[PDB]
């Protein structure tokens, strides 16, 4: 995932689940990318869809 433009204050509101390397389901790209910023970039994408 390209998070090179985050953190972003405003996100679109689609539900597009992503499964992180932390075993948590992120609701969409914008939530995932802000969570990548929050993890100090340790978080990666395990797969597309729910964990």
């Amino acid at each position: 995932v390209d998070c090179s433009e985050y953190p972003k204050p405003a996100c679109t509101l689609e539900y597009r689940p992503l499964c992180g390397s932390d075993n948590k389901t992120y609701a969409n790209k914008c939530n995932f990318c802000n969570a990548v910023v929050e993890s100090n970039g340790t978080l990666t994408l395990s797969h597309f869809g729910k964990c």
């Binding site: 433009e5 985050y6 972003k8 405003a10 509101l13 689609e14 539900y15 609701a27 969409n28």
Partner: protein, 185 residues
């Protein structure tokens, strides 16, 4: 199926905006970021019940799209849940509004600003947006903003959530209706 209800693409879930028509042809409006790249829409997470097919999409710059119904069986209520919709109107600052979406249900508040520019990043800038104090969460995109019997907008994006509160932005529905020559019913 009516405004705020779950709709499912091949990759996720958004919300139905309003049911609309042109002559005898029925459609629904939703967000343009939902319709962008999507073809088929389903009524269920199993993707075994087809709703219809994407007929148009305008994202960025705006945030609206339209899906033509192909399913003759599914009811196409001219409502947002129990609320009858009978006209469309432009948003005004202070207007009493309600949003419905497939994640958070029905939430009420007010229009705080008009003509907001919202930069989602990567060249995805939307102009002319309605700003409100109503919260929303992922899956709510595309859901109606309405004021009684009047359709006002379609859920685009926001900040925050329905636990601590937030700010949500909406595509004026009149622009979507004009684009496709459709009307609420």
């Amino acid at each position: 199926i009516s405004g705020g209800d779950a709709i499912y693409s091949s990759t996720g879930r958004c919300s139905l905006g309003f049911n609309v028509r042109s002559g005898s042809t029925y459609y629904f409006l939703t967000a343009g970021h939902c319709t962008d790249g999507a073809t088929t829409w389903w009524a269920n997470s199993a993707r075994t019940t087809v709703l219809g097919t994407t007929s148009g999409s305008s994202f960025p710059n705006n945030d609206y799209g339209i899906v033509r119904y192909t399913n003759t069986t599914i009811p196409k209520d001219g409502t947002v849940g129990g609320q009858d919709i009978t006209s469309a109107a432009n948003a005004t600052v202070g207007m009493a509004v309600t949003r419905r979406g497939s994640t958070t249900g029905t939430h009420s508040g007010s229009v705080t600003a008009l003509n907001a520019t919202v930069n989602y990043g990567g060249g995805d800038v939307v102009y002319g947006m309605i700003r409100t104090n109503v919260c929303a969460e992922p899956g709510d995109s595309g859901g109606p903003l309405y004021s009684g019997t009047r359709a006002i907008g379609l859920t685009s994006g926001g900040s925050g959530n329905c636990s601590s509160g937030g700010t949500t932005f909406f595509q004026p529905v009149t622009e979507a209706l004009s684009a496709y020559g459709v009307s609420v019913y």
